[PDB]
């Protein structure tokens, strides 16, 4: 047996963030 | 021969979330 | 012995920023 392989490619983008909070009531 | 390499670096931060529901009228 | 293949893809990154609040 020989050496371990090179390191893999960089991962994908993380999960999309939470939707913003509902706005406050207007005047 | 040898084993496959370690996992790559961690990926990018996710996309920013959609905006909030623009608040109701007064 | 010759080296193994490149490893797997890395884990996905952190979760995105929370979205902006809705307008007043």
């Amino acid at each position, epitope marked *: 047996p020989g050496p371990p392989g090179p390191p893999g490619p*960089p991962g994908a983008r993380g999960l999309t963030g939470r939707p913003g909070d509902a706005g406050p009531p207007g005047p | 021969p040898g084993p496959p390499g370690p996992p790559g670096p961690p990926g990018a*931060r996710g*996309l920013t979330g959609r905006p909030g529901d623009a608040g109701p009228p007064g | 012995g010759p080296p193994g293949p490149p490893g797997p893809p890395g884990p996905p990154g952190a*979760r995105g*920023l929370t979205g*902006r609040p809705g307008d007043a």
Partner: antibody
Amino acid sequence: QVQLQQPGADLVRPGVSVKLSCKASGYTFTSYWMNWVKQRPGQGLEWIGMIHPSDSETRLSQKFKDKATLTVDKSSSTAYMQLSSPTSEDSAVYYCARLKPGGTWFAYWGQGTLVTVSA
Amino acid sequence: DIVLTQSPASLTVSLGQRATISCRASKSVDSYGNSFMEWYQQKPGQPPKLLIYRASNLESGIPARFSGSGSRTDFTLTINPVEADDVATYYCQQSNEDPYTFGGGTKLEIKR
């Protein structure tokens, strides 16, 4: 070693567009967001926006939406930020910056470009 | 925007003393068990340098004299004992909500 290379200075007349560069090395450029931050000397910091070079997906601060334009060149591993019709309020240090891979904290920073808006 | 208010604006401290810098957020920066608060040190002519991530985690290469605590809307940066090299401006920054936002900073000056 991660590296974000920015010119020290950029001088424009009032009204002439400035285009800032941030040359990246030491990592896979197309895999990570590039963020831009503004700092007037003597003052605090403002996040401008970010761009992901793989698909040129973009988020801009609402304050800068009509002011800043973010692009990349995959071939030279360079991120650009263009500022329209500059005024004296646009004179500032501008940094490019990066989150730690898998993280949510700005671990890497360019040295900054001092933009001067002057005749 | 999440607004971060730092206190005080400037702090004067003798060598070997404890320095305490406060940061309040206009709304919570906690998400799914994590506090999205960073602390930076900035010396003149240099970019901000990361000290503390996720409220309390020491960044590699940062001495243990620096520590961070808090959650929700209240955060603290502690320097103990203070050293000469620590003269600087310090910033908190939230990384929870779009857009990223910074505190106005705290200048650390040393009494001698």
